[PDB]
Amino acid sequence: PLHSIISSTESVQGSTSKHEFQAETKKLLDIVARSLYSEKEVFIRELISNASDALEKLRHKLVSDGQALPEMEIHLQTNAEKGTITIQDTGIGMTQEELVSNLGTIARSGSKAFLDALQNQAEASSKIIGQFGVGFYSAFMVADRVEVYSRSAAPGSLGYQWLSDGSGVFEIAEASGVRTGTKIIIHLKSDCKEFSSEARVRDVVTKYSNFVSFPLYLNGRRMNTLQAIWMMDPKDVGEWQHEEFYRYVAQAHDKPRYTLHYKTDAPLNIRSIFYVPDMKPSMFDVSRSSVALYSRKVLIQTKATDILPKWLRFIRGVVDSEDIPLNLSRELLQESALIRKLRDVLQQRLIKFFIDQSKKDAEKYAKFFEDYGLFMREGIVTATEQEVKEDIAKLLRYESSALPSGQLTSLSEYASRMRAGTRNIYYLCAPNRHLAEHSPYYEAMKKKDTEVLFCFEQFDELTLLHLREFDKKKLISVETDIVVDHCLSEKETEELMAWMRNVLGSRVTNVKVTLRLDTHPAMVTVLEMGAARHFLRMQTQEERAQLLQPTLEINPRHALIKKLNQLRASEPGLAQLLVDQIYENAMIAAGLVDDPRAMVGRLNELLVKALERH
Amino acid sequence: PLHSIISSTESVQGSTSKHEFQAETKKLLDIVARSLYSEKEVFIRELISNASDALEKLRHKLVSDGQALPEMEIHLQTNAEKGTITIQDTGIGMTQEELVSNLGTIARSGSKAFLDALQNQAEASSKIIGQFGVGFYSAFMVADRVEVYSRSAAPGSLGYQWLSDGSGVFEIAEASGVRTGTKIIIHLKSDCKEFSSEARVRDVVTKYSNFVSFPLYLNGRRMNTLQAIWMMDPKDVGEWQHEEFYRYVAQAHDKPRYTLHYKTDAPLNIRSIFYVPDMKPSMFDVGSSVALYSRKVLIQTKATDILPKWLRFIRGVVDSEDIPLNLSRELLQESALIRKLRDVLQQRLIKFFIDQSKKDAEKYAKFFEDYGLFMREGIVTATEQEVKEDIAKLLRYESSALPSGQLTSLSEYASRMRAGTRNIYYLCAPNRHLAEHSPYYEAMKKKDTEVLFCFEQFDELTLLHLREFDKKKLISVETDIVVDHCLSEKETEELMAWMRNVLGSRVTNVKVTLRLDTHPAMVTVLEMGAARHFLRMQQLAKTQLLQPTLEINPRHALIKKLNQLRASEPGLAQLLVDQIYENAMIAAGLVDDPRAMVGRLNELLVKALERH
Ligand SMILES: Nc1ncnc2c1ncn2[C@@H]1O[C@H](COP(=O)(O)OP(=O)(O)NP(=O)(O)O)[C@@H](O)[C@H]1O
Ligand SMILES: Nc1ncnc2c1ncn2[C@@H]1O[C@H](COP(=O)(O)OP(=O)(O)NP(=O)(O)O)[C@@H](O)[C@H]1O
Ligand SMILES: [K+]
Ligand SMILES: [K+]
């Protein structure tokens, strides 16, 4: 189907012209006011940012001159009956030239020109928000008529006025009585009268601009009353401010148990603070990042980016940066490379912080791991890189067989003093220390003088089998190692073997003899056990039986096995129930029984007919 | 103190001037090329959309004129030697005035002017994609200089060239040899030569512009070759097209078991199709592949969840030409249209499932067996009572008043109850035999009221969360055991006292029940289902004991033996009573990991039979 008219036959003959790009202002205004912001409340944020920029410019101008500092405040006002919202400022202001150059031209901002002509861009380039030049036109999205009063702080400037309706035309006049600074008056739409209500405005202000750098008022009462401590050095801020900030951000009533104050500028500008709660995690904590992203003291509202890995969703705090790329809508540029490196840097720093906490305090870290271990266990099984899994795995605490009861140990220190020339790590799963010590599998391997890691928590064998390796060493379970490893008369032993294969033929594949058991009359061995256990309870005897191949062993030294001889010689019917009970007990001890409700009736029958002579 | 400085001293006294808004083109171009799109490959989508719009305009003009229709298609070519990407079409083309007025002006689109002068605005308004007027400038995001060779389709037009480096100035000249249509030459940047490779371009084309209305060829081979059946009439489309489309969109090799072809226009313009896979859900299956389209081009938000989370097991495509879009052609967040669409889709899917259940019970039984967990999860995660009750109509249970294996629903159960009765009784067990031989059911065996048997796990939790159906209260059998209002008493009261002193710290109280026939003991707690669920959570994970009561029956043979056992073998008697208590707790379903009781059971087995 190769039919390509693509060629280079084109050739230029006529004289080349020369033109300049134009623009359609009405369509640009319509696009800005209709299809730019997904929410209608952002105009308050934009106006507050503009007021903050004006105040910052005035403050810098006065500081560079060494003059006295007047008051620097933002004043919001709402009039319910008139349906208007008013924001006042005490910044630099602007004359009619700046009025018609900035408010009359799309995508032109004087703040960028101010920053460029500063020659330092250190003291003030970190405190100016405006960079695009279209933020003022969001007021037309909720208004039908905008009215602005302003006058410059220069000694001899006069007031002015600025009216528009968002219809591609604006009129400028000269006004008297204007207070120095800038004042914006907004007349609201019919369908946007909700913004004349004090509660809605307060909610928006607290959601977006709580940490503005200047005092802010709404109808007369100050709303800041709280310093952004993440911008200060740790040596200046006390613990009371830390706990109050944690109380504010976490919406809790307890104290933080861990506090990290992170400030870095080499790879990228990062100023963040992190908290770990004092209570235990709950159902909502497991349910679905609780960390707010900021940029020059303005919320970005990611709510989907998850700048922090999912398994770290239990920590709280704020993250602030100056170099994140944000689009024209003042939202994150989704899945940029900078975000993907910020996440890795932050998670590595958090891992390093958690590792160091163990050294300086052991009991507190043990309690924290007891509380928040499930998050680390989940983080093991969702990562992909082996290095990440090994980094997280250093936080796990286990109980070993070479140490006294009730004290923990780590994998790294487990590998410290293990056998000189064996690249193997052995772990056993049991609900208790008592069940781990007297487990048939542990007895079967107790001959070897190796240290076994007892793990009691749930979803732990799953974590080990997804880890598969630590410091280039294999993680081998005791159950697998037993099969990997390579009295009663023999005539009666073999005859009872034949009988057991006869009776338990359908459920059991093979029977063997074992001298490695001393306190358990039976044991069930499968070629693999951890994966079988995990698979069994996601999904009656048979359809589970051929999926396991339950090899069963017998202990000739046990008393019950010995008595089974003469209880079959005397009454085969009782032995019929006895062997089934032994098999059920062995399968229960192996941990392969999901719901043991089935065996209750047969156990009752065996008990009621076994001792009837007594 | 209330610090307020607001006054109204401002007054105007001069003569108002008049101006109009200007614009800065350099800053606008920088904003478009740098801080508008999250990805760099979207320029191919914009160019293909422009070519499709041009072809649509030419086709409409020719059909309205009534003239013959020539061949029309778009060609996209890749040349890695010069690091260039080229796109060519055979549309209407542009004149010199059209070139200057359209390509040289920001936020001006001729497609809107064409639509406004159509006099019907319905025939072709559903096929024109461009609406903003800034999509052509995304080519400067990956290029340093662009070339445009165009020639209008009018009988007497002349060729032209449109050159620009994206620096804010462009030059236009007259060219010779240009064929009818348009042709765009792109010279890629140093870091953007990734797009001079066939594989990446093919990936982008298949991702974004796979279902365009006109044939396109990449380096000579057709790419789309597949019809978008979600726009065609259901009667015009057969089974083979449905199977092929399903195997494409679902990326599977099986045959769908259910097919819904939804197409409505009254509340909103909707064209959609939904599929149910034949294979069972996997470990991995537990953005849902319901990708949203608009004007036959992918929107690709994949995060707003236009469909409820519990309905993530269905595959298909949803199209809507009235959806609002951002300047970057991404979904507007939380628009009322999105919520209306989600509600309508949920209701329609529920109605479709109900109708499918009515039409064929045998297939619906298998479907419910395969996909039961999703409905329970949706019931648990729902908030509104009507939403919970709508989903609950899809649940199936078997009851005691029916032969084994036959399932029914809550609707018929409510239909066939007595008029006086106002509540529903349900019992949970892993098997029917355990259900009908449960100690709790034997106490409810006296009355003839029907009871629903639940076998699958999380059924108890779902029934607890639902809490009400059709103005009736959902209560369990174990709850009603306590709400409802041969070992003579003398030789028995002291025997319960003996259990009390032996089991002081494990059972709060022990008494005698007479509603038991086959069990030696039975254990009751106040709120059995809730206690069971919390115990399962705690043993599953430490998140943020209880009060058990034990009843015996003086008629069981095994219990009758314990009376004389106290005076003969107390050492055997203690651990035998422990076995009885633990067996009762296991039968109650309140037992944790039962490995702890193996050793004492073995000691019972060894000791109790050292006499035969
Ligand atoms: N209250 C104010 N006082 C003084 N100048 C102001 C005030 N509000 C706006 N301006 C000026 O108006 C210009 C344009 O405002 P604006 O539309 O917000 O652009 P921007 O804020 O710099 N960029 P952005 O807000 O991020 O989209 C600014 O550069 C200021 O010079
Ligand atoms: N291949 C083409 N043939 C003819 N006209 C074209 C072609 N490509 C672009 N144009 C013209 O270019 C104008 C503006 O281009 P464009 O930037 O794509 O705006 P738009 O596609 O109409 N709206 P949008 O794509 O949503 O930004 C269109 O109105 C067309 O008239
Ligand atoms: K501006
Ligand atoms: K244009």
Ligand SMILES: [Mg+2]
């Ligand atoms: Mg601004």
Ligand SMILES: [Mg+2]
């Ligand atoms: Mg376009």
